[PDB]
Amino acid sequence: GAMGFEIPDDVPLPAGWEMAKTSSGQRYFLNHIDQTTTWQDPRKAMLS
Q1: Theoretical Cys-Cys bridge with 13: which of 17, 18, 27, 39, CB 3.0 to 4.6 Å?
Q2: Residue 19: which of 11, 30, 8, 9 has the closest Cα?
Q3: 32 near 18, Cβ under 8 Å?
Q4: CATH code (residue 25)
Q5: Number of domains in the chain
């Protein structure tokens, strides 16, 4: 997007996490060890 609201792809997810997309292009995030799934980007947790 023109504003780049997303956290840049160069910033890795936390260890043990992966990102996926729906068929409509919506991002979601998988936490392997807790087997949890969320729409919220975990990388925002590290913003000041």
Answers
A1: 17
A2: 30
A3: yes
A4: 2.20.70.10
A5: 1
**Residue type, position 3, single letter:** M
Contact 46, 17 (CB under 8 A): no
Q: Cα separation of 35 and 9, whole Å?
A: 23
Determination method here?
X-ray
Q: Count the Cβ atoms, other than its own, within 10 Å of residue 35.
A: 7
What are the E-state strand segments in 1-48?
17-21, 27-31, 36-38
CA proximity to 18, closest of 6, 7, 33, 29: 29
What does this entry list as its resolution, in Å? 1.6
